[PDB]
């Protein structure tokens, strides 16, 4: 499913995502994707700090989701 992630920058990049996928391979994506380290990325959703061992799921994350990224 697609989800968004938006930046301070004023960029929002789109991902390609599963559910059942970790914090933390998501943050490997986005290194992937737009070359930010996963060690400064703090990602937010629904007022929530993203833990690396939890899934988009245990979030109740869904499609069209907006995660907000600040960089430590
Ligand atoms: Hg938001």
Same mark, same amino acid.
Do not use: C, W
């Given at each position: 499913? #697609? !989800?968004?992630? /938006? =930046?301070? =920058?004023?960029?929002? !990049? =789109?991902? @390609?995502? @599963? +559910? &059942? *996928?970790? !914090?933390?391979?998501?943050?490997?994506? !986005? #290194?992937?994707? @737009?070359?930010? +380290? +996963? *060690? #400064? #990325? $703090?990602?937010?959703?629904?007022? /929530?700090?993203? @833990? *690396?061992? $939890?899934?988009? &799921? *245990?979030?109740?994350?869904?499609?069209? &989701? =907006?995660?907000?990224?600040?960089? $430590?």
């Amino acid at each position: 499913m #697609q !989800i968004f992630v /938006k =930046t301070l =920058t004023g960029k929002t !990049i =789109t991902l @390609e995502v @599963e +559910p &059942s *996928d970790t !914090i933390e391979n998501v943050k490997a994506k !986005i #290194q992937d994707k @737009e070359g930010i +380290p +996963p *060690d #400064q #990325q $703090r990602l937010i959703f629904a007022g /929530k700090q993203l @833990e *690396d061992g $939890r899934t988009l &799921s *245990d979030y109740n994350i869904q499609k069209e &989701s =907006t995660l907000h990224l600040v960089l $430590r």
